[PDB]
């Protein structure tokens, strides 16, 4: 059993679907639900900011990718490997990978290709986990992600 993969897929899939549909999935998480819940809540906060802070660049890359159908969505794995995997690994770049994923998912909703969203989530998860497992494990996986982005309450 690959717990890191399963957890990654659940978090990434949920975020992409919630971003596309604008509705929260009410179903419980699987194993390690408390961490997966906090991870999804962290992506909500941080992912939305990345999409807005890099709006122009996001729009430019989307137009360059020219995503119309299932076969274009399939071709994105190669591009993710090219851009994400072949560079420095840090939580910021992982958030961009997943946030751009959400950006693509919303686009797939707009062109009425919602069925490609879960395959896309699987592709993103494959790239993240299968190319960066060592780093992810060393950084404490999703617990580490949550701890990295944790914000202390302000006084007063």
Ligand X SMILES: CN1C/C=C/CCCCN2C[C@@]3(CCCc4cc(Cl)ccc43)COc3ccc(cc32)[C@@](O)(C(=O)O)CC1=O
Residues making contact with ligand X (CB under 6 A):
50, 54, 57-58, 61, 76, 79-80, 83-84, 87, 93, 96-97, 100-101, 104, 120, 124
> Cβ of residue 129: shortest distance to ligand X, in angstroms?
14
Residue 114 to residue 105: CA distance in whole angstroms: 8
Judged by CB, which is closer to ligand X: 11, or 104?
A: 104
Residue 67 has phi, psi (to 5 degrees) of -95, 115
Position of minimal CB gap to ligand X: 96
Judged by CB, which is closer to ligand X: 32, or 119?
A: 119
Say which residues have a Cβ less than 8 Å from residue 132's Cβ, sequence separation at least 6: 85, 89, 94
Judged by CB, which is closer to ligand X: 29, or 61?
A: 61
> Cβ of residue 67: shortest distance to ligand X, in angstroms?
9
Judged by CB, which is closer to ligand X: 20, or 80?
A: 80
Residue 35 to residue 17: CA distance in whole angstroms: 19
Residue 107 to residue 96: CA distance in whole angstroms: 16
> Cβ of residue 155: shortest distance to ligand X, in angstroms?
32
Residue 90 to residue 34: CA distance in whole angstroms: 23
Angle between helical axes of 55-65 and 91-110 (0-180°, round to 10): 60
> Cβ of residue 68: shortest distance to ligand X, in angstroms?
15
């Amino acid at each position: 059993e690959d717990e890191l993969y399963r957890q990654s897929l659940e978090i990434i899939s949920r975020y992409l679907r919630e971003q596309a549909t604008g509705a929260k999935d009410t179903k419980p998480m699987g194993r390690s639900g408390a961490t997966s819940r906090k991870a999804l809540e962290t992506l909500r906060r941080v992912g939305d900011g990345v999409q807005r802070n890099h709006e122009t660049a996001f729009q430019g890359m989307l137009r360059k990718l020219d995503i119309k159908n299932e076969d274009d969505v399939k071709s994105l794995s190669r591009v993710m490997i090219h851009v994400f995997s072949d560079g420095v690994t840090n939580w910021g770049r992982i958030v961009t990978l997943i946030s751009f994923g959400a950006f693509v998912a919303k686009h797939l909703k707009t062109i009425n290709q919602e069925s490609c969203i879960e395959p896309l989530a699987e592709s993103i998860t494959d790239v993240l986990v299968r190319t960066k497992r060592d780093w992810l494990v060393k950084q404490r996986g999703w617990d580490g992600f949550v701890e990295f982005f944790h914000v202390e309450d302000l006084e007063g």
